[PDB]
Design a protein around this ligand. Structure first.
Ligand SMILES: CCCCCCCCCCCCCCCCCC(=O)OC[C@H](COP(=O)([O-])OCC(O)COP(=O)([O-])OC[C@@H](COC(=O)CCCCCCCCCCCCCCCCC)OC(=O)CCCCCCCCCCCCCCCCC)OC(=O)CCCCCCCCCCCCCCCCC
Ligand SMILES: CCCCCCCCCCCCCCCCCC(=O)OC[C@H](COP(=O)(O)OCCN)OC(=O)CCCCCCCCCCCCCCCCC
Ligand SMILES: CCCCCCCCCCCCCCCCCC(=O)OC[C@H](COP(=O)(O)OCCN)OC(=O)CCCCCCCCCCCCCCCCC
Ligand SMILES: CCCCCCCCCCCCCCCCCC(=O)OC[C@H](COP(=O)(O)OCCN)OC(=O)CCCCCCCCCCCCCCCCC
Ligand SMILES: CCCCCCCCCCCCCCCCCC(=O)OC[C@H](COP(=O)(O)OCCN)OC(=O)CCCCCCCCCCCCCCCCC
Ligand SMILES: CCCCCCCCCCCCCCCCCC(=O)OC[C@H](COP(=O)(O)OCCN)OC(=O)CCCCCCCCCCCCCCCCC
Lengths: 105, 80, 344, 139, 120, 163, 169, 48, 97, 98
């Protein structure tokens, strides 16, 4: 950073734990460990100004591994559809909703 | 100095103990035959699953089977 | 102060900025800011005069809420990017918060009200630390994040500060507050070039430190918090009248002295980046700052104000000397201009 | 915001109505902000007194906004020359005069006229010459 | 700016690469200035402390003229490097990205026709 | 329910609105002690037994209690009827509903679905907060040292201020 | 459509025996049915996808049922008395059903030739040879961008010197 | 069922990697009985 | 969470409006100030918990430890004020004008 | 849940018992019934700077089982000690003294 007394001294008191893909205790990988990796091994050697346009696929994905919002919109839409159809009985609670269907190990 | 501890053991007989056990606990680990095992008995516990490595034939030690004579055998933790 | 306490505090006031600068995990940057807040408050109330408690209670509330806002920015980032640190992707509002917050701790522009008042109730000494070793920390955080901050806001806070600082200074007669106001102004120039060339911020700061540190140790040599008080400098200690004159004109941008370089290269960098609108208005009111600097010049040097008879008594007694730092920081400051190319 | 910008889109001197409306709003907005700072600091004595001050500042500012807009647009209309700093100066000239009146001072009108008009003229030039304000770092 | 450059020494003063550059001549006007800048600091000190201005602290005067100068050679040695890096960096880019910095042909005045505004 | 968290979140805002109307120094302390209870509960909802209880143990009874304590010693002069504040507070109680309402019709929404415990190992152990907080002693031993100095130099800062 | 195996495919005979009996016959289930279970893991951790190793999964669900099937014919009654006490606890400790353990181990030491492992002989990482081709580009990582080019050469005193304002330097 | 109106592609993974997104609790049981969502989302916290 | 994370954030803004709009007693402010630290602590803990990011749980607590002392300093200033004026009203803190 | 039920039942019992208390019964001036304890405040923030101490000492139960056991020991001892030295300073400061 402003004064890199850490790299110089070789110590790493503040770097080992800055991202979700850092070593998690007992090797319990966090959500998205896959993406963030893919989005920081990409932006390594390429500065930010160019980690912001071409390495946009990996952030657009990592922005949806963690926010997980585009999913919501899908699911929420699906939800509404069911509702309308169901009200007119167009759609019926699936066998799953009816339960059973052989819940298995 | 040695006879100053004698009133501090007669009167004030608390802080003596608190600075005699504060420390005792700093020297017991550095001088005990069994302090090595605490980072080892705590290192043996397989909390998560041991992922097996693919065989190449270039690995003699890696014990092929759970019951091979090879590998981390703890006849130590037993009767530690 | 039990010398032990003095050490713990001073260490914290010094570990405070240093952790901020060294760390990259923003969190660790926040606690560096937090320590500085905790360490400075004890020293501020050393006299424990009724004015002092007011000073600290203001400084603390202003510092504390800003600290909480900076933490909120870090907490929000943590959810927009798992990282604990600002990145290209950071939501713009996330960064703007950090600018406002950090511009409160540094006291720039529309948040410039606390500084003049705390500079008025603290001793001259703790005044220096509160003005110059407490600006290093927040600025570090900004300079690190410069690529990402907004050019518009900074400029507005920059211009505002320049104006507020200048206008405020014109009326003030208390020295501590004249300096507080100058610092607001210089702090403004510094934050103007941050988005464009951070390296110049670090020059417009050092020069400010090499200018203000001699200026304050001058104010306290005779411990004068009044211009009337500094005006009788000619009787109390005549030699410092010459350099006090040049350092104050150096603090303003007049060309032969070292003080021109920061303004000159900041203007050169802003014109290189095309802000010939902004740069022009800043330079113009920058000229207002020199007016109040020269008004003080008038009272202290160019004209000799009348003195009390007891001043002869203080002359008799040997005057405790000014530390060496005064000289080395007065000359390196009043005249290094011939060596500008290597400074930048 | 697509609104304020509209002021610039249509050629100057044309559609004065829109111009005056937009200019009046900006002044008024500034009025509110200005009154706010004026009330937050240097507070009033009674809520009503302060509501009044907000009104006073808002209207005065709205007025300077209107006359600026109206004068500049019309000056251009009557003069038929759309692109001319002078149009704006006359406008700024007028705007200052309104401020002067609201403050009941001929002198203020003096400084107001010159300073305000000059500023507005520079805005016109700025737009004509494509001057960039608050520019992004392009080094 | 120049930070983030490949190979950057994270906390070093002047990387050995700066050995390649010529050393600053000890009498470089600048170092000589720093000397005078220093002597003056010394003289000033004597003055503020009310001592015979020139005839006092003749040991200090030396510490000053010799501290400032010492500092200079090792600073200038660096600032010189920094500037030298700037060219290495600048010139290189001009080439690696040649098209963006294309050589231009300037028509002899014979060809170009700048208009003539008469003073009259 | 599924809106296990929302409801609570709403209660947390209510308590913060109470602290924001700046009610009498100790009547609002209660307010904090209420939303601290509420925030203690939410974290528990997500499985942070330790982190959660921690709040109920330190901020709740340690920090807050000491706060009111001092209120009693000073700044509990208990000289606007809080009832007026409760009146306003009630306004906000539903005024916030208004803020939510716009986005309510706009609608995530319909209470709270699977917007909690996103991913949990359906098998496995050692997955539990307090294993993470105990990284103060392995792989995150710098946060531990700096916290020490805070509290440690805290002693010296407080006494010096008090003296 | 994201590939999602047909439910029909997923159909496999299943263990369907409560956790208690699994916990009883586990240490023998680590001795036997290990080559068939580790290769699943060795696919599972290499090939990070449950839509590809389902092959070896059906094998695991197979060798296990094999394990018990022998125990059901061979030495079933003493096995029933073992987990029938072990499931009485609230955490199914071996610490209590320790007499039922040897009575089942000697019944299984004689018949079927099995010997229960020693203490630490299921925590070692065995090396399992398999044929599954190495899953390259796991994570389907789109090609990375190239590093910025490297200006090259040696430093030469700067050109014409600091090019500052009239500082001929 | 539930999807015969326009502009819908069944199984439209929202990511681009095509790697195995470990399904989220929500997507796994959500559209299923109100009981399942809790039993997955609150079964352990509620005890034993 | 996305929904809730909003409530906590507005809680912090409602606590923000509180500390930036004083009224009489200071102890109210300091109290409000603390309302933010709770909201920050809750939000930091919440996201860390649903990101399964255990490496970061240290922070939720470091935030509290620093915030507690911060408040300790704040209250000592407060006690200092109602020892010099004895009424702790932000109203009398105006000597510095 | 169960915990909810219990804690809630525990409340209802408490409330009822005060409900009955103010209603079963069914003027006379019957109702008719200070300086700062600086010492107290001190004691209070002494407790704040120590309660937080515990909060940083509660991880021990789960850190004892860390691989770097040697590290935990070291890290802990310092905390307990630096906090004892603080208390000790208070002692000398006589802050502890009432
Ligand atoms: C008097 C004491 C002299 C001691 C002499 C000791 C022996 C010695 O040094 O002689 C050999 C030595 C041999 O020199 P050289 O390198 O062979 O000379 C050829 C150079 O090309 C000739 O030098 P150059 O021109 O190549 O030097 C490069 C650069 C060198 O830069 C400098 O050294 C600047 C020095 C300024 C003085 O040029 C400049 O000076 C650019 C800056 C010009 C001024 C810019 C600022 C103007 C406004 C401010 C004016 C000063 C205000 C001060 C503050 C207010 C005070 C009240 O002579 C010197 O180096 C010293 C020359 C004089 C230095 C300044 C003395 C005053
Ligand atoms: C680029 C040019 C910039 C401008 C240069 C010229 C202006 C220099 C700055 C002057 C600023 C102060 C003006 C008013 C000074 C008043 C001094 C005074 O009142 O006299 C007392 C003072 C101290 O007295 P003391 O030395 O103790 O003994 C006498 C006791 N009555 O007596 C003294 O202070 C004596 C020492 C005074 C300082 C001597 C400075 C001589 C002039 C320096 C010129 C430098 C020119 C450089 C040109 C560069 C060209 C590139
Ligand atoms: C044909 C000639 C056209 C001339 C147009 C310009 C002058 C128009 C003057 C109209 C009358 C203005 C006036 O009388 O007010 C003077 C103004 C306020 O003066 P005040 O002290 O408030 O008292 C006024 C009491 N009725 O005091 C002022 O602030 C006056 C500001 C405007 C001054 C205009 C003349 C300036 C001349 C500068 C010459 C420079 C060479
Ligand atoms: C650079 C050189 C510029 C030269 C400009 C020359 C203009 C001369 C105009 C004639 C002189 C007018 C004058 O000097 O009056 C000073 C005026 C006196 O006071 P008075 O007008 O009664 O109102 C007091 C308000 N506090 O004092 C005042 O009124 C001060 C307050 C009014 C300020 C008016 C100008 C505002 C400009 C806003 C520009 C926005 C962009
Ligand atoms: C453009 C940007 C505009 C930004 C807002 C600007 C608002 C105007 C600023 C200047 C207002 C005029 C000065 C006087 C204001 C004032 O007196 O109110 C302070 C308020 C009331 O408390 P007190 O300080 O006791 O005042 C009583 C006065 N008899 O003290 C408080 O309100 C303390 C906080 C409690 C109320 C807010 C609590 C949070 C919830 C808010 C919900 C919405 C409330 C809307 C009002
Ligand atoms: C007006 C009179 C005064 C009114 C207020 C009186 C005081 C009220 C408070 C009394 C003391 C309550 C103390 C609660 C502390 C927190 C309890 C806790 O965190 O444990 C809940 C537990 C956490 O999960 P875990 O530890 O893993 O469970 C074991 C199996 N896994 O498992 C759970 O998460 C269970 C579900 C959460 C239950 C938390 C406690 C809820 C208390 C609700 C009180 C209101 C009841 C409903 C209305």
């Amino acid at each position: 950073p402003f004064l890199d007394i850490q790299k110089k001294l070789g110590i790493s008191l503040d770097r080992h734990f800055m991202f979700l893909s850092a070593e998690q205790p007992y090797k319990n990988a966090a959500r998205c460990h896959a993406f963030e990796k893919e989005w920081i091994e990409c932006a390594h050697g390429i500065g930010g100004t160019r980690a912001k346009k071409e390495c946009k696929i990996e952030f657009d994905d990592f922005e949806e591994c963690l926010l997980r919002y585009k999913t919501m919109r899908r699911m929420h839409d699906i939800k509404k559809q069911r509702e309308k159809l169901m009200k007119e009985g167009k759609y019926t609670p699936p066998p799953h909703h009816s339960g059973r269907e052989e819940p298995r190990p | 100095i040695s006879a100053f501890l004698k009133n501090a053991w007669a009167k004030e007989p608390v802080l003596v103990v608190s600075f005699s056990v504060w420390g005792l606990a700093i020297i017991m680990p550095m001088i005990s035959p069994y302090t090595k095992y605490a980072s080892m008995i705590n290192k043996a516990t397989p909390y998560n699953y041991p992922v097996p490595v693919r065989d190449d034939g270039n690995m003699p030690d890696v014990p092929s089977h759970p019951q091979d004579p090879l590998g981390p055998s703890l006849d130590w933790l037993k009767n530690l | 102060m039990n010398p032990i306490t003095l050490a713990i505090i001073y260490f914290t006031i010094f570990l405070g900025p240093v952790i901020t600068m060294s760390s990259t995990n923003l969190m660790l940057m926040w606690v560096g800011l937090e320590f500085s807040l905790l360490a400075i408050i004890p020293m501020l109330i050393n006299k424990k005069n009724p004015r002092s408690t007011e000073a600290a209670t203001k400084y603390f509330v202003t510092q504390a809420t800003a600290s909480m806002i900076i933490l909120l920015a870090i907490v929000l980032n943590y959810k927009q990017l798992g990282t604990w640190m600002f990145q290209q992707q950071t939501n713009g509002l996330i960064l703007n918060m950090t600018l406002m917050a950090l511009s409160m701790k540094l006291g720039l522009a529309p948040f410039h009200f606390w500084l003049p008042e705390v500079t008025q109730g603290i001793p001259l000494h703790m005044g220096l630390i509160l003005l110059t070793w407490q600006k290093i920390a927040p600025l570090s955080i900004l300079i690190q994040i410069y690529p990402l901050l907004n050019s518009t806001i900074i400029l507005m806070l920059a211009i505002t500060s320049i104006f507020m600082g200048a206008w405020g200074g014109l009326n003030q007669t208390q020295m501590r507050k004249i300096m507080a106001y100058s610092s607001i102004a210089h702090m403004g120039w510094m934050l103007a070039i941050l988005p464009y060339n951070p390296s110049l911020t670090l020059l417009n700061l050092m020069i400010y430190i090499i200018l203000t540190a001699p200026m304050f140790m001058a104010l306290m040599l005779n411990n004068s918090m009044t211009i009337n008080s500094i005006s009788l400098l000619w009787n109390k200690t005549p030699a410092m009248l010459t350099m006090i004159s040049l350092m104050l004109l150096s603090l303003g941008g007049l060309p032969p002295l070292t003080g021109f370089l920061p303004k000159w290269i900041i203007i050169t960098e802003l014109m290189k980046n095309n802000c010939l609108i902004m740069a022009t208005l800043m330079a113009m009111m920058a000229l207002l700052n020199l007016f109040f600097y020269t008004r003080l010049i008038y009272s202290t040097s160019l004209t000799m104000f009348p003195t009390n008879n007891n001043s002869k008594m203080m002359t008799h007694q040997t005057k405790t000397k000014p530390n060496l730092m005064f000289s080395t920081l007065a000359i390196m400051s009043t005249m290094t201009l011939p060596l500008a190319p290597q400074l930048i | 915001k697509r609104f304020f910008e509209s002021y610039h889109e249509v050629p100057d001197g044309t559609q004065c109505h829109r111009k005056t409306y937009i200019t009046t709003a900006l002044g008024g907005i500034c009025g509110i902000i200005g009154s706010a700072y004026s009330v937050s600091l240097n507070p009033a004595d009674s809520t009503l007194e302060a509501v009044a001050r907000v009104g006073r500042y808002t209207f005065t500012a709205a007025a300077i906004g209107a006359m600026f807009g109206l004068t500049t647009c019309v000056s251009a209309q009557v003069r038929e020359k759309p692109d001319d700093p002078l149009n704006y100066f006359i406008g700024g000239c007028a705007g200052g005069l309104t401020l002067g009146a609201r403050t009941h001072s001929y002198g203020t009108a003096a400084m107001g006229c010159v300073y305000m008009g000059t500023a507005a003229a520079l805005f016109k030039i700025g737009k004509l010459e494509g001057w960039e304000l608050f520019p992004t770092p392009k080094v | 700016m120049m930070n983030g450059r490949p190979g950057h020494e994270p906390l070093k003063f002047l990387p050995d690469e700066a050995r390649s550059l010529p050393p600053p001549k000890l009498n470089d006007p600048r170092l000589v200035y720093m000397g005078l800048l220093g002597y003056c600091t010394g003289l000033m000190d004597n003055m503020l402390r009310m001592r015979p201005v020139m005839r006092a602290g003749l040991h200090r005067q030396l510490l000053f003229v010799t501290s400032f100068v010492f500092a200079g050679y090792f600073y200038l040695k660096r600032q010189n490097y920094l500037y030298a890096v700037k060219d290495h960096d600048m010139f290189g880019y001009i080439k690696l990205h040649p098209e963006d910095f294309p050589e231009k042909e300037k028509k002899t005045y014979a060809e170009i026709l700048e208009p003539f505004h008469p003073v009259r | 329910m599924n809106n296990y968290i929302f409801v609570l979140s709403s209660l947390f805002l209510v308590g913060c609105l109470g602290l924001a109307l700046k009610p009498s120094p100790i009547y609002g302390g209660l307010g904090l002690i209420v939303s601290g209870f509420v925030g203690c509960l939410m974290v528990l909802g997500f499985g942070g037994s330790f982190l959660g209880l921690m709040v109920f143990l330190i901020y709740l009874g340690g920090m807050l209690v000491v706060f009111g304590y001092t209120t009693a010693m000073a700044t509990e002069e208990y000289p606007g009827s809080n009832w007026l504040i409760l009146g306003f507070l009630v306004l906000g109680v539903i005024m916030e509903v208004f803020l939510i309402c716009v986005l309510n019709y706009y609608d995530l929404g319909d209470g709270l679905g699977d917007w909690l415990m996103y991913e949990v190992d359906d098998v496995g152990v050692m997955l539990e907060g307090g294993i993470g907080v105990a990284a103060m002693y392995s792989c995150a031993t710098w946060m531990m040292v700096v916290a020490g100095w805070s509290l440690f130099a805290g002693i010296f800062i407080i006494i010096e201020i008090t003296r | 459509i994201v590939e999602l195996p047909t439910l029909e495919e997923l159909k496999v005979e299943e263990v369907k025996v409560s956790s208690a009996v699994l916990k009883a016959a586990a240490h023998h289930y680590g001795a036997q049915c290990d080559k068939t279970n580790k290769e699943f893991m060795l696919c599972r951790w290499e090939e990070k996808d449950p839509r590809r190793c389902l092959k070896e999964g059906k094998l695991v669900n197979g060798c296990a049922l094999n394990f018990f099937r022998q125990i059901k014919s061979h030495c079933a009654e003493p096995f029933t008395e073992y987990w029938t006490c072990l499931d009485y606890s609230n955490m199914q400790l071996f610490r209590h059903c320790r007499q039922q353990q040897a009575k089942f181990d000697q019944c299984v030491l004689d018949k079927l030739g099995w010997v229960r492992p020693d203490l630490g002989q299921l925590s070692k990482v065995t090396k399992v040879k398999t044929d599954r081709p190495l899953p390259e580009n796991p994570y389907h990582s789109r090609a990375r961008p190239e590093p910025n080019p490297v200006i090259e050469g040696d430093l030469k005193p700067a050109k014409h010197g600091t090019r500052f304002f009239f500082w001929t330097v | 069922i539930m999807k015969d109106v326009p502009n819908w592609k069944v199984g439209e993974s929202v990511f681009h990697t095509t790697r195995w997104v470990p399904p989220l609790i929500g997507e796994m049981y959500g559209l299923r009985t109100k009981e399942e969502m809790s039993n997955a989302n609150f079964g352990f916290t509620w005890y034993t | 969470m996305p929904s809730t994370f909003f409530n906590l954030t507005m809680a912090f803004s409602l606590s923000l409006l509180g500390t930036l709009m004083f009224r009489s007693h200071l102890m109210s402010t300091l109290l409000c100030l603390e309302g933010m630290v709770l909201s920050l602590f809750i939000m930091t803990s919440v996201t860390s918990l649903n990101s399964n990011s255990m490496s970061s749980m240290p922070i939720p607590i470091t935030i509290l430890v620093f915030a507690a002392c911060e408040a300790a300093v704040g209250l000592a200033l407060l006690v200092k004020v109602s020892n010099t004026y004895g009424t702790d009203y932000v109203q009398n803190l105006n000597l510095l004008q | 849940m169960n915990l909810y039920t219990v804690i809630f039942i525990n409340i209802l019992l408490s409330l009822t018992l005060i409900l009955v208390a103010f209603w079963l019964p069914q003027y006379s001036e019957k109702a008719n019934p200070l300086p700062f304890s600086m010492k107290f405040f001190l004691v209070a923030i002494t407790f704040l700077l120590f309660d937080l101490e515990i909060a940083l000492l509660l991880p021990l139960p789960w850190a004892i089982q860390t691989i770097k056991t040697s590290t935990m020991m070291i890290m802990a001892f310092i905390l307990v000690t630096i906090l004892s030295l603080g208390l000790a300073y208070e002692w000398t400061q006589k802050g502890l003294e009432w």
